[PDB]
């Protein structure tokens, strides 16, 4: 649950992402894959990537980064009223991709890391607080659907 002022911070930060969605999406996935190499094994189309240089050179990884952040941005713009947008993603990630909630924690922290890396000194403590709360809400509502499905 976020206040109006917190949502305003989230959507202000998101403007930074929308200026370069592919570059942000690429770096988020690279941070996930290099920090948590077990996550790469869930992607049949990226498991061939052995080095970060190959990851950086992969145009399909940048494409998928655009898909991921476009979906997340659509959810964030609903300011919590995201049941219709979130349900299909919860279902596909639990039942088809088999993504444990832990990996959603990993990618949430990766987003925070990338924002500081690309905007050092321009991602203030209030903005980090609000973005963190928004990603916690996203993860918590996914977790509720995971529990319904019995997925661990
Ligand atoms: C912010 C969190 C995430 C968002 C918004 C997101 C979004 C998406 C979307 C929109 C798709 C394509 C449609 C679909 O299959 O539902 C997708 C596919 C997929 N996601 Fe995610 N995802 C997220 C996190 C993760 C994480 C953490 C993992 C694994 C560590 C993951 C694994 C996958 C896989 C394996 C696919 C299929 C890729 C393919 O072969 O095309 N997702 N995701």
Ligand 1 close to Cβ of residue 92 (< 6 A): yes
Expressed in angstroms and rounded, the spacing between residue 79 Cα and the centre of ligand 1 is 21
Q: Give the residue from 82, 72, 80, 93 showing the smallest Cα distance to 21.
A: 72
CB 80 within 8 Å of CB 2: yes
Please state which CATH number belongs to domain 1-152: 1.10.490.10
Resolution of this entry in Å? 1.4
Please work out whether the CB of residue 151 comes within 6 Å of at least one atom of ligand 1: no
Atom number in ligand 1 closest to CA 108: 1
- For residues 63 and 23, what is the distance between their CA atoms, to the nearest angstrom? 10
Query: What's the chain look like in SS3?
Result: CCCHHHHHHHHHHHHHHHCCHHHHHHHHHHHHHHHCHHHHHHCCCCCCCCCHHHHHHCHHHHHHHHHHHHHHHHHHCCCCCCHHHHHHHHHHHHHHCCCCHHHHHHHHHHHHHHHHHHCCCCCCHHHHHHHHHHHHHHHHHHHHHHHHHCCC
């Amino acid at each position: 649950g976020l206040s109006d002022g917190e949502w305003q911070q989230v959507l202000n930060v998101w403007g930074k992402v929308e200026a370069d969605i592919a570059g942000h999406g690429q770096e988020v996935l690279i941070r996930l894959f290099t920090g948590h190499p077990e996550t790469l094994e869930k992607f049949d189309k990226f498991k061939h990537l052995k080095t970060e240089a190959e990851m950086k050179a992969s145009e399909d990884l940048k494409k998928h980064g655009t898909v991921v952040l476009t979906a997340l941005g659509g959810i964030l713009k609903k300011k919590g009223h995201h049941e219709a947008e979130l349900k299909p993603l919860a279902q596909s990630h639990a039942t088809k991709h088999k993504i444990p909630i832990k990996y959603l924690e990993f990618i949430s922290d990766a987003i925070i890391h990338v924002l500081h890396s690309k905007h050092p000194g321009d991602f203030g403590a209030d903005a980090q607080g609000a973005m963190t709360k928004a990603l916690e809400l996203f993860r918590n509502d996914i977790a509720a659907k995971y529990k319904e499905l019995g997925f661990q």
